[PDB]
Amino acid sequence: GLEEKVTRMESSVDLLQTRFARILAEYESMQQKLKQRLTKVEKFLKPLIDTEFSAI
Amino acid sequence: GLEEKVTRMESSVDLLQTRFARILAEYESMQQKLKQRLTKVEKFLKPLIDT
Amino acid sequence: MGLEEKVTRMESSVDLLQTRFARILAEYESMQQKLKQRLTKVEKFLKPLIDTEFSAIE
Ligand SMILES: [Zn+2]
Numbered sequence: 001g002l003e004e005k006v007t008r009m010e011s012s013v014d015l016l017q018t019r020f021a022r023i024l025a026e027y028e029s030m031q032q033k034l035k036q037r038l039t040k041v042e043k044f045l046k047p048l049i050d051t052e053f054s055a056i
Numbered sequence: 057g058l059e060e061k062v063t064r065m066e067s068s069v070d071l072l073q074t075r076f077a078r079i080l081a082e083y084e085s086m087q088q089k090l091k092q093r094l095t096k097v098e099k100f101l102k103p104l105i106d107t
Numbered sequence: 108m109g110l111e112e113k114v115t116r117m118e119s120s121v122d123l124l125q126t127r128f129a130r131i132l133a134e135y136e137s138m139q140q141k142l143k144q145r146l147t148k149v150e151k152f153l154k155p156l157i158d159t160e161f162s163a164i165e
């Protein structure tokens with residue numbers, strides 16, 4: 001019965017990794033979009049930032 | 057012998073899954089707050105930033 | 108032979124799972140802190156600038 005249990009556990013752990021992989025992929029994809037958005041904001045503001053702090 | 061080892065691996069997976077669920081939940085919640093904050097900021101700069 | 112072999116392989120898979128994720132978790136905390144710092148600088152610059160130069164934007 002033990003070998004049966006461990007055989008099944010293999011597929012269960014595989015299922016878990018597949019779930020995890022997708023949840024992570026989605027988190028990272030969103031993280032990626034926030035960075036892109038943030039970077040556009042920083043680029044847009046760069047001239048204003050420099051106007052406040054950097055001569056010439 | 058092997059029964060106790062397998063039991064211990066079941067518990068490890070259990071703990072790991074639980075750590076994952078809770079920790080990813082805390083990261084997703086913080087990510088939402090960052091999105092909200094970024095959306096406010098962008099609202100100030102529209103429609104200029106989009107153009 | 109079959110049983111012991113599965114137990115051995117399973118031990119290794121579970122170790123790998125736990126290590127992989129300790130590593131992913133470290134990258135997240137790092138990228139999230141950096142994102143927060145960047146956003147915070149933007150916010151801290153933009154509020155007083157709006158207030159003093161571009162006031163109707165609010
Ligand atoms: Zn100025």
Ligand SMILES: [Zn+2]
Nearest residue numbers: 118119121122
């Ligand atoms: Zn091990």
